[PDB]
Amino acid sequence: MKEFYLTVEQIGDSIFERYIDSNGRERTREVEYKPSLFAHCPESQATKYFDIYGKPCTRKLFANMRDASQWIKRMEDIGLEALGMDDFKLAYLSDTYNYEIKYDHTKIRVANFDIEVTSPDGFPEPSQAKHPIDAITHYDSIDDRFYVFDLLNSPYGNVEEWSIEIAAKLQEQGGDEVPSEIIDKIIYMPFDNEKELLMEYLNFWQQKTPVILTGWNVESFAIPYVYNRIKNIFGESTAKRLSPHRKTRVKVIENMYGSREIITLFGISVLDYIDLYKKFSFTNQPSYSLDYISEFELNVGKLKYDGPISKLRESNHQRYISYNIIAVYRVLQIDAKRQFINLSLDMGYYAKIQIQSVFSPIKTWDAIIFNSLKEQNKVIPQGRSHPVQPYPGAFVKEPIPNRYKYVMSFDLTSLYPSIIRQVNISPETIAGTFKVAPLHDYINAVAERPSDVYSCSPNGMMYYKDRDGVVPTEITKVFNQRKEHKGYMLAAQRNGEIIKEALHNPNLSVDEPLDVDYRFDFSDEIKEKIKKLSAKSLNEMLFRAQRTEVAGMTAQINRKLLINSLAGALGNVWFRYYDLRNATAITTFGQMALQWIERKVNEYLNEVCGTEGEAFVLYGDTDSIYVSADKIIDKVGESKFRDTNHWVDFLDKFARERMEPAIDRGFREMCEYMNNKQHLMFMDREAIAGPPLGSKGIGGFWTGKKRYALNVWDMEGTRYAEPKLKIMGLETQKSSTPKAVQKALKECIRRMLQEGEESLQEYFKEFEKEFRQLNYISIASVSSANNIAKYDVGGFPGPKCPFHIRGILTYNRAIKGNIDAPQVVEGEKVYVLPLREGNPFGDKCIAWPSGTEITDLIKDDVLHWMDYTVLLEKTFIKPLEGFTSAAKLDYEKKASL
DNA sequence: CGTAATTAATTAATTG
DNA sequence: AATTAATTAATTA
Ligand SMILES: Nc1ccn([C@H]2C[C@H](O)[C@@H](COP(=O)(O)OP(=O)(O)OP(=O)(O)O)O2)c(=O)n1
Ligand SMILES: [Ca+2]
Ligand SMILES: [Ca+2]
Ligand SMILES: [Ca+2]
Ligand SMILES: [Ca+2]
Ligand SMILES: [Ca+2]
């Protein structure tokens, strides 16, 4: 096997690299790297180096890395360009690994942990860390073992050792229910006093120093606390042992009075899972407590205990230690399903960057292009300073707010990455400019042809057609990877619906789940055996098919997110290849591509229907159009269709056979008209929406831009077993909206599109009657807590203070005195509830941290004054009024006249 | 230190 | 109430 690195850092003029050799063992080294930088030189001088624009460069090899740093400083005030990779560690990895890396994750020591700290004077701040650490659970990837460290004696209580026998027992039995699969993998370690626990953990840390370190909030709590408590006990230099190189940095955050810090251990790539999640999950959550996320991702129970958390050890020490392990493990379950760690490594290595650098797409693309160019002996241009500027983006069409019965959408395959490829947009493929006609003259094909030599964009930019640019070439590779993983995801999706269609009639047999590969569609062979399967074996097959989908999803969505970020990065000033001329060239083309095809599709469906100038494209957004199919089903008659599925198959066949060839005819012409490099505007059909055949439902509606819902039967190949709702932008998809309300409105949309006006009315009074009996947390609103510092004038709402902050400033006065109350963290998310006028809180609403039940001392007083009539009108009624008024419907039958 | 476009619910102020 | 403008938080792409 080939060699690969694990972690890379720079300390002085020396690079510290932990790696895996050709045999497959862990080795650490220290190299006096000699970095080379570049500068422009005389025309007539034979050398093998050129900058990206083609101009020659002379190589300056430096004796050490300070000499290379010094050199750039001098080059600046003198006024010359210092070309080459100035982030030197990357230039080390590009040399020491001149090939495409193939890592073996089993060799990479991934470790994730969590600690527990008992604090009876408030929330234990990691910066002070004046309280004892009374637990640590620390998993290892190569050991496959849970290393539990239990403190039995502390000046906050002395507790009997943790029973592994009780731990295994079920919750309902009196136990803690630690999943039996890991129970044999726990290696329990209790301790006499605090100091001797920490000493052992460090030896273990040395013997088994992590390469990837993770967990839940480990960066903002665990690591900060571990380091700081050791600083208070063993010293700073003994705490510096957490880095396998001894070097560590401390970053302190603001903050008027409150001090929070983030520690940087050199030689360990830290990826905090909470970060990973927000970045790669594509879910905006109400709460980011480990409990809530596990509930959401794994449908597992919630960690139930009595008393505040600061007193849990005292009473239920058994559950305290047990729950600690579960936490450490729950993350591992989230990753087995989500596979973000795998993604971090897939990306990190392909880019040749520190693994924690995957959070930065600019740092990612800078390494990808540098390595792309270096093999061609080209030299990267120096990073410049730019003023921040707004620039035009995507075109969004204004729809007529209305119901729409039959709808087919048509979407562009990875649009912005495609335009880069079609036009050949790169920093070095720029030719010049041209006279820009109104965008509309290009949309209507009436303006003069921009170029007969160059590839052009309606933002007035010409690009070379001869040899490929470095960006289009680099984005293609990653787009191809993205694609492969999507074709997987889509199968596991299609195969999910084959299991669900068959689950209609499950057999009362005793059979077992077939061993099949879910990334590829079931053959009409395996399909037939599924139709004979037990309900037991069908549901287990469905799980497997869905987990495959998730895993596939993660791969394809974040590879997408990555390449889209490159397009966006051209608009961020810190990106080495920042160029508004290029970013606008993309977006502007996008605007033309959509509005051009809006014309073309309308022009076709008039020529097919023999009609003259009627509208069919009703709404468009960035890269997709929505086509009304009313006239199509009208022309063949509603009477003629056997079942709902029959007209779906008919529109399916129509869109693929009659439309797409005219759509691809239209995009080929636009290519000619723009004299582009390559035609890459592929628009296939996406969703097929409509009511159930012979039902009262309305199909779909629009309430305006970026807000609508659809009854979708087919979603780009996946024929759904049960009709599925596509809701975009409505309060059902907004995290701020209460869970009970999200659920309720979704049933309203469901009945609107599927069952008719009459159905809506019946359910509306069904809900209004159940509302006042529902749990507060479910019916409470959510919002982020930004700028709470500003609107606070020593308590009480300031000038123009937002509704939620107003609510928080209520909380602070209520918990004035109570230490056993959770503090509202700036940036964190909170629940918001409106009180009635005349309450012990002296305000119109209150707010408290998300996830957590509101502290005992005020909880009673909140429910004692909650304004349900307002909460219902605000969250539920007003948005539904929005839906029905834009759909020509009534939710509550008129009591008047 | 990836992006823009767009919404709805706020509030402070003015509708003689 | 009902307009507008200004601000915040959240979407869709
Ligand atoms: N976070 C995002 C997502 C969207 N867009 C741009 C890039 C896309 O090209 C275009 C359309 O986005 P889509 O949601 O339709 O995703 P793609 O077209 O990129 O991929 P797919 O082929 O799956 O539709 O909008 C963007 O700039 N940044
Ligand atoms: Ca905990
Ligand atoms: Ca798309
Ligand atoms: Ca698509
Ligand atoms: Ca069956
Ligand atoms: Ca789309």
Tab-separated table of C-alpha atoms in Angstrom, chain A residues 287-514:
chain	number	residue	atom	x	y	z
A	287	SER	CA	-32.474	22.787	19.127
A	288	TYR	CA	-28.905	21.517	18.956
A	289	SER	CA	-28.860	19.588	22.211
A	290	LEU	CA	-27.499	16.069	21.773
A	291	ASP	CA	-30.807	14.693	23.068
A	292	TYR	CA	-32.910	16.486	20.437
A	293	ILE	CA	-30.660	15.568	17.507
A	294	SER	CA	-30.528	11.874	18.445
A	295	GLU	CA	-34.319	11.861	18.737
A	296	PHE	CA	-34.472	13.364	15.222
A	297	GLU	CA	-31.775	11.273	13.488
A	298	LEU	CA	-32.369	7.979	15.325
A	299	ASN	CA	-35.908	8.083	16.807
A	300	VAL	CA	-34.420	6.901	20.103
A	301	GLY	CA	-35.751	7.851	23.555
A	302	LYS	CA	-34.850	10.966	25.533
A	303	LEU	CA	-32.420	10.775	28.492
A	304	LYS	CA	-34.889	10.901	31.388
A	305	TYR	CA	-33.725	11.922	34.886
A	306	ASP	CA	-34.940	13.550	38.129
A	307	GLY	CA	-33.671	16.815	39.620
A	308	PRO	CA	-31.360	19.380	37.982
A	309	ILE	CA	-28.248	18.113	36.165
A	310	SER	CA	-25.943	19.504	38.903
A	311	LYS	CA	-27.481	17.065	41.414
A	312	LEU	CA	-27.769	13.973	39.209
A	313	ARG	CA	-24.443	12.477	40.343
A	314	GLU	CA	-25.431	12.790	44.016
A	315	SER	CA	-28.632	10.771	43.698
A	316	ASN	CA	-28.480	8.676	40.533
A	317	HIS	CA	-24.723	8.181	40.046
A	318	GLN	CA	-25.572	4.959	38.208
A	319	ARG	CA	-27.615	6.833	35.591
A	320	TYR	CA	-25.089	9.715	35.598
A	321	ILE	CA	-22.163	7.579	34.403
A	322	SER	CA	-24.428	5.440	32.223
A	323	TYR	CA	-25.976	8.441	30.412
A	324	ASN	CA	-22.456	9.801	29.882
A	325	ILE	CA	-21.500	6.702	27.893
A	326	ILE	CA	-24.722	6.766	25.871
A	327	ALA	CA	-23.945	10.356	24.864
A	328	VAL	CA	-20.427	9.397	23.711
A	329	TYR	CA	-21.994	6.530	21.758
A	330	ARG	CA	-25.011	8.361	20.314
A	331	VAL	CA	-22.691	10.522	18.215
A	332	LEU	CA	-21.159	7.322	16.822
A	333	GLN	CA	-24.656	6.211	15.793
A	334	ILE	CA	-25.306	9.561	14.107
A	335	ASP	CA	-22.077	9.142	12.118
A	336	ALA	CA	-22.817	5.550	11.117
A	337	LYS	CA	-25.998	6.864	9.490
A	338	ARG	CA	-24.703	10.272	8.423
A	339	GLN	CA	-21.039	9.481	7.575
A	340	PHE	CA	-19.624	12.983	7.945
A	341	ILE	CA	-16.254	11.774	9.275
A	342	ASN	CA	-15.927	9.675	6.086
A	343	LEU	CA	-16.788	12.748	4.024
A	344	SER	CA	-14.286	14.904	5.941
A	345	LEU	CA	-11.551	12.414	4.998
A	346	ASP	CA	-12.733	11.844	1.405
A	347	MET	CA	-12.656	15.624	0.872
A	348	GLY	CA	-9.608	16.477	3.002
A	349	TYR	CA	-7.321	14.000	1.226
A	350	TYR	CA	-8.583	14.726	-2.310
A	351	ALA	CA	-7.772	18.382	-1.657
A	352	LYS	CA	-4.572	17.581	0.285
A	353	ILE	CA	-5.449	19.758	3.307
A	354	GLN	CA	-5.737	19.461	7.084
A	355	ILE	CA	-8.961	17.564	7.788
A	356	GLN	CA	-10.416	20.404	9.908
A	357	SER	CA	-9.958	22.575	6.796
A	358	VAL	CA	-12.964	20.913	5.114
A	359	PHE	CA	-15.126	23.519	6.888
A	360	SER	CA	-13.498	26.113	4.615
A	361	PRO	CA	-14.411	25.636	0.903
A	362	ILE	CA	-12.018	28.462	-0.071
A	363	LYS	CA	-9.108	26.775	1.750
A	364	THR	CA	-10.342	23.582	0.041
A	365	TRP	CA	-10.490	24.953	-3.524
A	366	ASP	CA	-7.200	26.817	-3.058
A	367	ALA	CA	-5.454	23.509	-2.399
A	368	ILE	CA	-7.275	21.713	-5.244
A	369	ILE	CA	-6.341	24.281	-7.901
A	370	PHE	CA	-2.765	24.729	-6.600
A	371	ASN	CA	-2.212	20.973	-6.877
A	372	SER	CA	-3.966	20.965	-10.257
A	373	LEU	CA	-1.633	23.656	-11.571
A	374	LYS	CA	1.603	22.505	-9.911
A	375	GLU	CA	1.672	19.244	-11.913
A	376	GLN	CA	1.586	21.395	-15.087
A	377	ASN	CA	4.481	23.470	-13.646
A	378	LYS	CA	2.297	26.592	-13.481
A	379	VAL	CA	2.422	29.092	-10.585
A	380	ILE	CA	-0.499	30.446	-8.523
A	381	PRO	CA	-1.015	34.257	-8.433
A	382	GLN	CA	-0.610	36.011	-5.052
A	383	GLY	CA	-3.566	36.666	-2.737
A	384	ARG	CA	-4.766	40.270	-3.124
A	385	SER	CA	-6.988	42.629	-1.116
A	386	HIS	CA	-10.456	43.529	-2.472
A	387	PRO	CA	-13.331	45.798	-1.410
A	388	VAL	CA	-16.583	43.959	-0.613
A	389	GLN	CA	-19.249	44.565	-3.270
A	390	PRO	CA	-22.811	43.407	-3.926
A	391	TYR	CA	-23.345	41.657	-7.274
A	392	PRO	CA	-26.431	40.360	-9.170
A	393	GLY	CA	-27.573	36.761	-8.648
A	394	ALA	CA	-30.313	34.369	-9.755
A	395	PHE	CA	-33.547	35.298	-11.568
A	396	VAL	CA	-36.781	34.503	-9.689
A	397	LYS	CA	-40.135	34.875	-11.496
A	398	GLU	CA	-43.237	36.429	-9.935
A	399	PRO	CA	-46.058	33.877	-10.109
A	400	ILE	CA	-49.762	34.661	-10.096
A	401	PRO	CA	-50.693	33.518	-6.565
A	402	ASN	CA	-53.195	30.780	-7.332
A	403	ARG	CA	-54.094	27.091	-7.242
A	404	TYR	CA	-52.689	24.955	-10.095
A	405	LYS	CA	-54.132	21.513	-10.918
A	406	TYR	CA	-51.609	19.759	-13.206
A	407	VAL	CA	-47.954	20.838	-12.976
A	408	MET	CA	-44.683	19.475	-14.393
A	409	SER	CA	-41.345	20.966	-13.381
A	410	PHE	CA	-38.106	20.887	-15.395
A	411	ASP	CA	-34.754	21.302	-13.634
A	412	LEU	CA	-31.180	21.983	-14.751
A	413	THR	CA	-28.487	19.481	-13.814
A	414	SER	CA	-25.944	21.165	-11.512
A	415	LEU	CA	-26.494	24.566	-13.122
A	416	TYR	CA	-23.770	26.918	-11.881
A	417	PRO	CA	-21.033	24.299	-12.142
A	418	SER	CA	-22.318	23.567	-15.664
A	419	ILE	CA	-22.190	27.201	-16.821
A	420	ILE	CA	-18.548	27.378	-15.700
A	421	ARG	CA	-17.954	24.345	-17.926
A	422	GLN	CA	-20.127	25.438	-20.866
A	423	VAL	CA	-18.671	28.961	-21.086
A	424	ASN	CA	-15.214	27.843	-19.881
A	425	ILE	CA	-15.080	30.427	-17.086
A	426	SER	CA	-11.705	30.521	-15.335
A	427	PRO	CA	-9.401	33.277	-14.020
A	428	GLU	CA	-6.973	32.640	-16.901
A	429	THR	CA	-9.417	31.928	-19.771
A	430	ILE	CA	-10.589	35.554	-19.960
A	431	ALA	CA	-10.325	37.184	-23.405
A	432	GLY	CA	-12.007	40.595	-22.991
A	433	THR	CA	-15.368	42.360	-23.012
A	434	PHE	CA	-18.117	43.303	-25.486
A	435	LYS	CA	-21.033	45.747	-25.898
A	436	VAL	CA	-23.761	44.432	-23.595
A	437	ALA	CA	-27.317	44.626	-24.922
A	438	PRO	CA	-30.263	44.526	-22.493
A	439	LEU	CA	-30.489	41.032	-20.992
A	440	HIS	CA	-33.971	40.835	-22.583
A	441	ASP	CA	-32.560	41.141	-26.112
A	442	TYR	CA	-30.452	38.040	-25.435
A	443	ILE	CA	-33.424	36.255	-23.858
A	444	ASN	CA	-35.531	37.039	-26.949
A	445	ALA	CA	-32.640	36.191	-29.318
A	446	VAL	CA	-32.897	39.603	-31.011
A	447	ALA	CA	-29.553	41.153	-29.976
A	448	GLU	CA	-26.437	40.770	-32.150
A	449	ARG	CA	-24.186	37.724	-31.654
A	450	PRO	CA	-21.613	38.696	-28.962
A	451	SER	CA	-18.727	36.730	-30.505
A	452	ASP	CA	-17.923	34.484	-33.453
A	453	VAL	CA	-14.540	33.535	-31.973
A	454	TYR	CA	-15.083	33.360	-28.191
A	455	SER	CA	-17.383	31.723	-25.634
A	456	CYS	CA	-19.614	34.443	-24.154
A	457	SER	CA	-21.942	35.402	-21.272
A	458	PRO	CA	-24.745	38.060	-21.223
A	459	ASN	CA	-22.674	39.951	-18.620
A	460	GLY	CA	-20.398	41.012	-21.487
A	461	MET	CA	-17.458	38.653	-21.014
A	462	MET	CA	-15.579	36.599	-23.584
A	463	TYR	CA	-13.698	33.396	-22.810
A	464	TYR	CA	-11.222	31.266	-24.763
A	465	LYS	CA	-12.425	28.115	-26.531
A	466	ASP	CA	-9.029	26.544	-27.396
A	467	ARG	CA	-7.537	24.967	-24.232
A	468	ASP	CA	-9.555	24.271	-21.076
A	469	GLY	CA	-9.305	26.521	-18.025
A	470	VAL	CA	-8.190	25.200	-14.656
A	471	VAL	CA	-11.512	25.881	-12.894
A	472	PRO	CA	-13.757	24.129	-15.465
A	473	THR	CA	-11.322	21.174	-15.475
A	474	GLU	CA	-11.249	21.022	-11.653
A	475	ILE	CA	-15.002	21.396	-11.153
A	476	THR	CA	-15.664	18.649	-13.747
A	477	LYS	CA	-13.769	16.012	-11.743
A	478	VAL	CA	-15.732	16.716	-8.537
A	479	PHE	CA	-19.024	17.013	-10.449
A	480	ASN	CA	-18.423	13.522	-11.868
A	481	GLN	CA	-17.909	12.178	-8.339
A	482	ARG	CA	-21.053	13.972	-7.175
A	483	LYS	CA	-22.986	12.389	-10.072
A	484	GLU	CA	-21.925	8.796	-9.325
A	485	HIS	CA	-23.077	9.146	-5.716
A	486	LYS	CA	-26.424	10.614	-6.782
A	487	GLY	CA	-27.148	7.714	-9.152
A	488	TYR	CA	-26.663	5.580	-6.044
A	489	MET	CA	-28.909	7.721	-3.849
A	490	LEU	CA	-31.672	7.743	-6.493
A	491	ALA	CA	-31.724	3.944	-6.777
A	492	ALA	CA	-31.973	3.378	-3.008
A	493	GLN	CA	-34.804	5.894	-3.302
A	494	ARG	CA	-36.515	4.042	-6.181
A	495	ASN	CA	-35.941	0.739	-4.356
A	496	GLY	CA	-37.456	2.229	-1.212
A	497	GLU	CA	-40.727	2.692	-3.094
A	498	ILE	CA	-40.633	-0.888	-4.447
A	499	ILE	CA	-40.528	-2.142	-0.855
A	500	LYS	CA	-43.347	0.262	0.081
A	501	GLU	CA	-45.571	-0.685	-2.896
A	502	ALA	CA	-45.156	-4.338	-1.911
A	503	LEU	CA	-45.784	-3.492	1.760
A	504	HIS	CA	-49.395	-2.840	0.746
A	505	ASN	CA	-49.941	-6.617	0.642
A	506	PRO	CA	-47.353	-8.213	2.933
A	507	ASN	CA	-47.290	-12.011	3.199
A	508	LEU	CA	-48.054	-13.808	6.442
A	509	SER	CA	-45.045	-16.049	5.853
A	510	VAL	CA	-41.812	-16.613	7.757
A	511	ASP	CA	-38.969	-15.548	5.453
A	512	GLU	CA	-35.785	-13.445	5.708
A	513	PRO	CA	-34.425	-10.210	4.118
A	514	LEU	CA	-32.565	-10.802	0.836
